[PDB]
Each structure stands twice: as structure tokens, then as C-alpha cells.
A paper describes a structure:
Human [name] (hBest1) is a [name]+-activated Cl− channel essential for Cl− transport in retinal pigment epithelium (RPE). Overall, the channel is a pentameric assembly with a single ion-conducting pathway, which varies in diameter along its length and is constrained at two narrow points: a “neck” contributed by three residues (I62/I66/F70 in KpBest and I76/F80/F84 in hBest1/cBest1) on a transmembrane helix, and an “aperture” formed by a single residue (I180 in KpBest1, I205 in hBest1, and V205 in cBest1) on a cytosolic helix.
Alanine substitution mutants for each of the 12 residues were generated in KpBest and hBest1 and subjected to crystallography and patch clamp, respectively. The corresponding “[name]+-binding” sites in WT KpBest are occupied by Zn2+, an essential component in the crystallization buffer. Notably, the short extracellular domains of hBest1 represent a challenge for quantitative measurement of the surface expression by labeling techniques (e.g., biotin).
Numbering used by the authors:
A (entry chain A): 21 to 289
B (entry chain E): 24 to 293
C (entry chain B): 22 to 291
D (entry chain C): 23 to 291
E (entry chain D): 22 to 289
Write the structure that this text describes.
Amino acid sequence: LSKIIFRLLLNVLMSIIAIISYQWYEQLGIHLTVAPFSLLGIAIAIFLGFRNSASYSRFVEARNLWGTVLIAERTLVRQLRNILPAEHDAHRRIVSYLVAFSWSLKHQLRKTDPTADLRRLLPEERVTEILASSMPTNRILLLAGNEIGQLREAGKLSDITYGLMDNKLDELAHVLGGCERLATTPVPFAYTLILQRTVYLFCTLLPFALVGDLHYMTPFVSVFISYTFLSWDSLAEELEDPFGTAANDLPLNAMCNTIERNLLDMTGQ
Amino acid sequence: IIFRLLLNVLMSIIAIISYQWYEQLGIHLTVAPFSLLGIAIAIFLGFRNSASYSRFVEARNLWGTVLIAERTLVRQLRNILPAEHDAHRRIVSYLVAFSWSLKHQLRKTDPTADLRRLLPEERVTEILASSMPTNRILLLAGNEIGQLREAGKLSDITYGLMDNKLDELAHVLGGCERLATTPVPFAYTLILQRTVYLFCTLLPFALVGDLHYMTPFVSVFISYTFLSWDSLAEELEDPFGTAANDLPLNAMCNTIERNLLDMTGQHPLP
Amino acid sequence: SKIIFRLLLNVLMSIIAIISYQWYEQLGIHLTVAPFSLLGIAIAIFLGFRNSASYSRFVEARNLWGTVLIAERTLVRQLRNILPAEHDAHRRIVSYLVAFSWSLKHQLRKTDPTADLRRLLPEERVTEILASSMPTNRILLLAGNEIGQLREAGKLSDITYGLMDNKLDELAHVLGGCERLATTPVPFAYTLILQRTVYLFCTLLPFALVGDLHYMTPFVSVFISYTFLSWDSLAEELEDPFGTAANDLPLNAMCNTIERNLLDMTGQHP
Amino acid sequence: KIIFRLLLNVLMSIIAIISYQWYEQLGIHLTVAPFSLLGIAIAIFLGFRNSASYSRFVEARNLWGTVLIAERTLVRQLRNILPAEHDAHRRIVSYLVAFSWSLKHQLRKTDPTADLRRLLPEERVTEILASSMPTNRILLLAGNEIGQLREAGKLSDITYGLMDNKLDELAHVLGGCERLATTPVPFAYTLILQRTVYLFCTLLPFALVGDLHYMTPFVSVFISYTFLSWDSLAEELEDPFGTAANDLPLNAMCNTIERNLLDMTGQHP
Amino acid sequence: SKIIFRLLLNVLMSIIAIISYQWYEQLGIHLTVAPFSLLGIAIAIFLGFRNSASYSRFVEARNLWGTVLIAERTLVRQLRNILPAEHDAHRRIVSYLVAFSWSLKHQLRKTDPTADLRRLLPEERVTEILASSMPTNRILLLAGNEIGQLREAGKLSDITYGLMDNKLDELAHVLGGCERLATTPVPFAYTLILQRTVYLFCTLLPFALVGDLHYMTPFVSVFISYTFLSWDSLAEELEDPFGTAANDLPLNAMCNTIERNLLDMTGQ
Ligand SMILES: [Cl-]
Ligand SMILES: [Cl-]
Ligand SMILES: [Cl-]
Ligand SMILES: [Cl-]
Ligand SMILES: [Cl-]
Ligand SMILES: [Cl-]
Ligand SMILES: [Cl-]
Ligand SMILES: [Cl-]
Ligand SMILES: [Cl-]
Ligand SMILES: [Cl-]
Ligand SMILES: [Cl-]
Ligand SMILES: [Zn+2]
Ligand SMILES: [Zn+2]
Ligand SMILES: [Zn+2]
Ligand SMILES: [Zn+2]
Ligand SMILES: [Zn+2]
Ligand SMILES: [Zn+2]
Ligand SMILES: [Zn+2]
Ligand SMILES: [Zn+2]
Ligand SMILES: [Zn+2]
Ligand SMILES: [Zn+2]
Ligand SMILES: [Zn+2]
Ligand SMILES: [Zn+2]
Ligand SMILES: [Zn+2]
Ligand SMILES: [Zn+2]
Ligand SMILES: [Zn+2]
Ligand SMILES: [Zn+2]
């Protein structure tokens, strides 16, 4: 959403400032060779490399977690069918909580209003309990645990099979903490701070130190070099907001729709 | 690939004969800045190829679980219900149908022939109705295990032992689906394959000042190295890609089918 | 940061450089950059791996604290779901769990737990806990006795007792995981052979730079020492993630979250 | 092996100093800076490649380590749960030992028949040898032992399950070894790397010679040793079930296993 | 920590190199710094990756020992919460658990466990244990039948016997993992290749540096040699985590911590 074709052509210009500036240079006692900029440029590419690595890892973890939502809810619906196929009332109740959980987890991470979706899926008295909590999504898990918890007290599930389905609720519980953790723990600011400073300074001092060698090609190369360090420093911030609505963020709404369609395929609806 | 090895050799033959009208005008290309650019690109290609490898390893691992989980499920059926061969046959069908259906799912090819060969056509049209056929095959396998439980042939404990194996497959389905809907860079593997593509053709212009008539040779050696590394990343990054090698995906569904018929003594021929 | 002493100090070492330059010719000291390129790149490579190792320690520490919140959340869920009427047990257990995480934060910060312990538990138990040389483990054992009594009371079966037992196991893994990241630091050689060689590289770098950039030398030398020394000290910050630096973990915020969570509505559930 | 390519390189370096006579007379000139670029690139790729090979080696050693652990504790549970069934003890142990040797034979593409025959009845050997996967069949037979103890009421479903889990663990080891064996990366890793490390090594002296003159062969083999030795160790580590120097001592590993399992069931090697 | 002899050899190497620089032209030897950039950078990359593998072995060792303290703690917590009356079996099992960790320590350090073993066990069992070529495994087998006895004595259900069996399984994986780290060392070719090339690089380096640094090379080259050599030997001080240096795992401390923890959880 924020772009830097601004600094690629501030480069083209601060490259042109350089060529005309050349002949008043050694006058002052100012020369700039590339060798120390090779040193720094390489030290920055190493550090850009490790950083982007962290950024990609955390994006992959965000996708893994949403992946698990689809898996655990798929299999918990399957277990309900295979263990209690008479029980379509309980089927339909548990399914609306599991769908509610995903929608509510999307809203929570986008900081939007789950109320419409919650009301689409759940009794109004259930919606009230969920929204009264300071942790609505976690309160949805508690309610689904009640559905199977009473199926247990009613003897329709044993402690064994109660256990098989509880574990899926633990899986979702790990997804929720995981998303909360990812959403409140960015890659430390120092990294992107330090890097965005040095990648910036280096990208505009570069056409200076390149002028002695390349003279009047300083722009077509000091740009090429700068774009490379910038399309690589940008791929970073394009990968550390996984839950947003931007283009390269995760399509959470589409994944929530896939989760809902999946569970309704499994229950006829 | 080798079309861009020869776009290079001629970009360099261009570079030598045109080198004459170069600093007639003041247009200098050292090799020191192009070595800072190259080392940087080579560093990023290192990390990029490192992430592709990991996607490739995870796909191989997920397919490994299919073989593992299906084998231990069938071993459990035999060990716990050694008499129930009709159930053995039915379940072994769905497991085999799951593997093939998954492979067809990932490579976006038609599963109908493999399903029609494995399953009763009532279940085949049910499976082909679902927008999630592989999931529906797992669901059907589950009803088999559940019926043995309703019938009292499986206890809740032993029903549970087999349920776990179906979970393992559930994880494999989603893992594979996640690994396919991606990439995660979007079109930034777009930008880096052209950043390499540009560098590799600007390069002989920068080298000609140092090597004259030999720059077609040293700049194609370098280009091959960079484009080989890059293209290797392209291949690893899309492990179920249409432009992939189906040998192991095919070999894997064939191994598991073979193993399973063996385990249910449908081999050898009497 | 605390860098700005040395980033300053470097500009005056880079000054001593330029007011003893042409004085080089007389004294016999040639001093090129390409050896300091080599030395610089090796230090960058080694700083790259050091910093990677430190982030891993940060990330694992953050995950361990994530699990406290997860495991404690789902343990209260199980109690609310299996023994829904047992509010005296719910509140007793919730208090130990909140005791557990505050007690852990004090343990890793080497501060006194007694305030928080008393805010939350009976003082007979506040003294049982401080009596133990391992108080967080003692809190775990107490939470296990509540779980265990409910089982001798016949309110939990063996199955449902195990279900809750496993969550206390999960927290025993957080405890040991944190003790390992605390009591096992990174080896000390890694920390100060590496920080002497980076500043030593920083205070000599201009003496070899002064020949190529003349006056420009304090600029580029300080640019380069910034890049190097900010990277090194970020590494030493994340290496100690239970510490109190600006990039360490917010352990107090995280214990409040756990607390607000388990006591969501004075502890009221549907 | 590697010292033949080292030898061919010092010869290539002599061909270089000799034919330096006719260099610009034949219209050539080769600087070092281009080869430092190419050379650092190859170093970086070799560094990552090598890292991947070591990972495979550690995973292969890991999987074998789990055979020992799982088999140890399966025997531990038989003794703790059924202290009286010494015949089950000896039959399961002979399968668990049969499993290990067969796994070795499998991964080494050799014949298990001797070892099988040493350890089991011939009616079993024939059943095992009939299988597309003998190790699978051995796991299934070990599974019958504990499964028959369960039909006899000597094992509950719970305690049958506990031991079944260990057989499940051996299944995973088998799968993982089978996956580490039938999954070499596309030779692209070897062809791109091995031939370009070869090719770079042999043209390095032609580019070193203008700078170093008679010193060419000394520095040119030092650089060539470093790269080749690095590349060649990568190739040993990536096939860890082979018979090379750095390859898992699978026979000793099997004897340690048999030694262990015989030691736990009161017998003497 | 006799890197310092290697660096003083390096100062002599550049003394020799400055002294010898005259007869360079005469003898026809040309040494630029550029091919040594290439080689040194390559060595750095490989040293970086190698050192990284060494760190990862050290960390796996510490995690393995971390699991001992965790698994033994929660086994004892389970015994107290499930069988709070049976303090006779608590003490039996705790002494088997504490025996395991001391026996593991001595096993990895190739020392005599008899002192700690007889300090904790009746000789009725200590001689059984040391008659085995796998003592620590046998201590696990012995802890196992304590649990098994309780089960067959009806005091444990299959379910609760199961719950504790899983913790013995955890200790089994620690045993296997530690043994695996001890017997399977990091491939020795790593330290050969690298000790050679790093040492040879550090001595050949002044002969390439003096062309352009003249009387300064003793300094610049001892620096570089200090960086490489000390990085390389950090990797080696990390590759044997079960050793004896203060650099290594304080296994005695960890075993004392484990003993105190399990004794404290029982009163003693
Ligand atoms: Cl699942
Ligand atoms: Cl329904
Ligand atoms: Cl499995
Ligand atoms: Cl059959
Ligand atoms: Cl059969
Ligand atoms: Cl949990
Ligand atoms: Cl195990
Ligand atoms: Cl026996
Ligand atoms: Cl545990
Ligand atoms: Cl006691
Ligand atoms: Cl006690
Ligand atoms: Zn799952
Ligand atoms: Zn239904
Ligand atoms: Zn966004
Ligand atoms: Zn059958
Ligand atoms: Zn067959
Ligand atoms: Zn959990
Ligand atoms: Zn309550
Ligand atoms: Zn000058
Ligand atoms: Zn000057
Ligand atoms: Zn295990
Ligand atoms: Zn026996
Ligand atoms: Zn499994
Ligand atoms: Zn555990
Ligand atoms: Zn006691
Ligand atoms: Zn007594
Ligand atoms: Zn002795």
C-alpha cells in the first residue's frame, strides 16, 4: 500500500545531482570509491537476508495456523458424524460454533465487528454471551465445549469419545493463541528500523561513490542496484502484516468462506 | 533456459563490436559495482532457494505420512479385527482412493477413472458431487470405522486408535492444500527472476572492458550459474506444480496401493 | 542506543585518522581497504549467524509464554465443561494458574514473588510456595492436587483426569523451557570475542579508509560502524529475552493478559 | 578421487603459466575480479547446499535412533505389563530384531534372507519375503503377537493401545527412511554445482596467472581444494545409507539394537 | 585456549614475510590480495555454516537434559496426585529417577556411576544394573516395573498406568538422543578440511598482504587470523557438549538440580 517508486527516482535525480557535482569534488578533499560501499552493501545484503527470513517464517506460521482451523474443524465434524450419526441437532449446533469461531477469529485479527456474522449463525442469546466476553473467540470455544460436554453428560458420548473431540478443541485453542501471539508480537522494530535507515542512506549515497567509476551511467546502474535492495527490503513489510486486507495479505474472508462451505458440505446443507 | 544462455552470447558479441562506440561518449561500466550487485543477488537467491527447498521438503513429508498412516491403519484393522475381511476390503478401497484422489486434486487432473476403478459407482458420484472430494473420501472411510464401532466390533478405545490415523490424513490433506493454493511471495518471484534476468544481460557490457574477446565465455558461465540456481528455486517452490515431475507422486500412489493389497493378502495371485 | 558513545568515539578515531594521513608516507605505512573488505565481510557473515541464533532464542521464549496462555485457557475450559457446577474448584485452580505465570515471571526476572502470591492465594500456601527452592514447580504440584482431589472425590474419571493432567504437563514443559533459556545462556566466548573484534574493526577501519576518501572518512566509517554495531547489540538484546531491554519480552503485560483471561467476567461462564 | 582432480588442476595451472606466453598474442585477457564474483556466488550456493545435505544426514541418523528407542520401550512395556508371557517376549523381540536388519537390507538394496532365516521360522521368512515391503510385513506380524494377547484377555484395549503406539512409531521410522532414500533432489543440485565447481576450478588458474605468474598453481590448488573438498563432503552426507566413509554404520547400529533387545529379555550374545 | 601460540606463529610468519619480501622479485613469486579475498570469504561462508551446525548440536544436548528435569518432575507430580498415600513407592520411584540422571551423566562422561548409584539404590539392584552393558536403560526398565507393580496391584488403572508410561517414554527418547549425540559425532571431515584450510590460509596470508601493507602486515594479518581462528575454535568448543570444559554443559549442576527438585517435591 506504501510504495517507493518515490525513492527509485529520487535516486535517478540524486544520481544526476552527482554527475554535475563531479568537477568540484577533489577540490574539497572529497573522493568516493566503490570498495567501501561494496563492504557496506554486502554487510547490508547479509542482514537484509536474515531479516526477510524471519519475516517469511512468521507469514508461513500465520498461514499454517489458519490451515489448522480448516483441518481440526473438518475432522471434528467427521467425528461427530461417525460417532453420533443420529444426532443432526447436535451436528448443526456444533457446526455453527465452529463456523462462528473462524468468522470471529477473522474479525478479531482485522479488528472488525463480528456481530453481523455472529447473528447470522447463532441464537441471539448466544451472541450476547460471546460479545459480553473480553475474549469473544475464546468464549466461542467454551460454548462448543459445552455442546459436546452435555452430549457427554447425556451419555451419548463416553469419556473416551468425549476425549477424541476435546483434542480438536485444543487444536483450535492453539490456533487462537498462535494468531493472538503473531498479532501482538511483530518482528522487533529495531530490525526494520536499523534496516530501513541503512538501506535508505546507502541507496542515495550510492550514486555519489559510483560516479568516479561509471561517470555518465551512474543513473541506469545506481537505480538498478537501489531497486534490488528496495524490492528486497519491501518484500519484508509486504510479509509482516499477514492478517490485513491488503493485496498480499492472507485472504481471511475467502478462507472463512471455504471453512463454512466445507462444514456444510459435510452436513448436507 | 538455454535460450537465455544464447541471448547472452549474442548480447556479448554485441558488447564487443559495440564497445568501440562507448567511451567515445563517457559511458563507463566497471566490474566492481556489478560484483556488489552480483553478490547481493546471489545472497538473496541463497535465501530464496532456501525457502523453496523447505516447501519441497514439506510436500515430501506430507506424502510420506500418507504411506505411513495408511499402512498403520490397515495393520490395525488386521490386528484388531482379523476376521472382518469385507471391512478390510472396503476401507482399503477408500485409502487407495484417497491417495489417487489427492494426487489428482493437487495436479488438477480428472480423478474419475481412478475412482471408477476403485469404488462402487454410487459412492463415486457422491464423491464427485462434493466440492471437496478428497475430504469426502476421508469421511466415507470414517463411516466404515464408525459402523464397526456401532456394531460393537470396535470399542471406543480401538475406534480411537484408528480415528487418530484418519486425523493424520486430514492433516495431510490440508497441508497439501495449503502448499498448493500458495505461493507466499505472490509476483515477487516475478521481480527477482527478472532482476536476475536483467543483471545477466547487462553483465557482458560491464565485463568487456576487462576481457574483450573472451566476455562471451566468462559471462555465460556466470549466467548459467545464476539462472541455474534461480530456475532450480522455481522448480522446488512449486512441488505439485503442473510443470512438475509426476514420477514420485505416481510412484507414491502406486507404492501405497501395492503395499495395501499385499497387507490384505490380495497379493500374491493364488 | 548505548551505541552513541562509540558511534561518536568513532568519529574522533576517524579524526585522528585524517590528522595523521600524509604523515603515513613519512612513517612507512601503506594501508589499503581490500584486506578490510575481507575482514569486514567475514565479520558480517559471523554477525549474520550470531543474530539469527539470538532471534531463535527470542522466538522460542515468546512461544513458551504463548503456551502458558493456551494451556491455561483450555484447562479452565475442560473444568467448565466437565465439572460445570464446581465453582469452588474452578476458582481454586484458576488462582494457582494465575499464581503460576506471575511466579514464573518473577523467577525469570529474579524479583520477589511474595506480593503477587499474596494478592492471589491463602498465606498458608504463600508460605508453602516460598518454602520450596523451586516455587513455580510447587504451584504446579498444588494445581495438580486440586485436579487430583476432584478425582479421588469421584467427580473426575481417570479419562477426564488425564485430559486435564496433560495440560499441567504442557505447563511443566514451559517451565523447563524457560529455565533452559535462562540458566543456559549463549556461551560467553561468542559475546565478547565478537564484540571486541567488531569495535576493533571499527576503530581501525578509518585509518585504512582515510587514503581513499580523504575528509569523507568519518562519514563512511561511522555509517559502517553504525550498521555493524547496531546489528551486534540487537543480537545481545534478543539473546536475553526475559530481560528488561527495549526489545525483550513484555513479561508483565503477558501476565496481565493471562490474568484478565482466566478471570474473564469475575470468572463467570455459560 | 578428489586428489585426481586436484592433480589435474595443478596440471591445468602449468598449462596456464606456459600458455601465458601467447596471451594477448592470441587476443585474450582474463582478470580476477570476475572470478571472485563467480567464485563467491558458488561459495554461497555450496554453503546452502551443504547445509541441506547435513540436515538429511542428521535426520537419517535420527530415524535410526528412534528404532532403538521405540524397540527398547516396546520390550519394556511387555515386561512391565505382561511379566509372565516370556514366549510373547521372545517372539516380539525376534520380530523387532528382524525389523532392524530388514530395514538395513532395505535401505542398502540387499537381500534380507540370511538374517531373516537366522532369526525367524521359515514359514515366516516366506511370508515376509513375499511382500513388496518386508519391513511392513514384519511390523504386521509383531502386531499380531500383541493383538493375539489382546484377544486372549491378557491385554486390555488400553494396554494393547500403549504398545500399538510403539509399532506406529516404527511405521514412521520406516516411512521416513524410505523417504530419505527414494528422495534425492533433482540432480540439478549436483549438475549445476558439481560441474560448475569443477569448471570454475579448472579455469581459475587461467584467470589467476596474470597476477601471480609462477605462483598460480599454489594458490590455484588451495582455492580448488577448499571448494572441491566442500562440495565432495556434501555428496557423502546426502546419501547417508550408503557404504562410504561418512555414511551411517548401519551394521553396528543393528548389532547394538539386537544387543539391547537380547539384554532386556535375559539372553546372552 | 592455545590459539595464542597460533597467532604468535602468525606474527613470525609476517616477520618472515617482510624480511623475505626483497627476494620475491628475484625468485619470481607474485602474491596479490584479490585471490585471498575470494578464498577467505569462501572460508568464512563455510565457517559460518559449520559453526551454525555446531551450535545446533549444543542446543539439542541442552534440550535433552531439559527434558529430563521436566519429565522426572511430572512423573513425581503424577504419583503424588494419583497415589498420595503410597509414599513407599514414591521414594522407590524417585530414587530410580535420580539414579537415571546420574547414570546418564556418568554414561556420557564415561565415568564410574557406582558412587552415585550405591548412594541411591540397594545393592540388590546396583549389581543388576552394572552387570548390564546398558545400565541407564536398565534403570528405566526397573522404574517401569515399579509402575507396573502398582498397576498389577490394582492401585493404578490401565489409564493411569498409561499416563505414567508416557513419561518413561520421554526419558527413553532422552537416553536415545544423548547416546546418539555421543556416538554419532559431527562428521569429522568438517574439522579436518576447516582446520587445514583455516590454518594454511592464516599463514599464507602475510605473504599476500605484505606486497601492499609492507611493515603493517603483522597487525592486519594477526587481526584476521584472530577472527577466523577464534570463530573456528568456538565451533569446536561447542561440538562436544557433554565434555568437561567450563564451556560445556554443567552436568553435575543439572543432576544436583534434578535431585534437589525431586527430593523437595517429596519433603526430604
Ligand atoms: Cl485433527
Ligand atoms: Cl445435520
Ligand atoms: Cl501413524
Ligand atoms: Cl481382506
Ligand atoms: Cl486380511
Ligand atoms: Cl492445550
Ligand atoms: Cl517410545
Ligand atoms: Cl523377558
Ligand atoms: Cl511431561
Ligand atoms: Cl514420599
Ligand atoms: Cl509424598
Ligand atoms: Zn489434528
Ligand atoms: Zn448430521
Ligand atoms: Zn496489510
Ligand atoms: Zn482381511
Ligand atoms: Zn504386490
Ligand atoms: Zn495444548
Ligand atoms: Zn465456574
Ligand atoms: Zn585520493
Ligand atoms: Zn586526503
Ligand atoms: Zn517414542
Ligand atoms: Zn520374558
Ligand atoms: Zn502416526
Ligand atoms: Zn512431557
Ligand atoms: Zn510420598
Ligand atoms: Zn513401608
Ligand atoms: Zn567400577
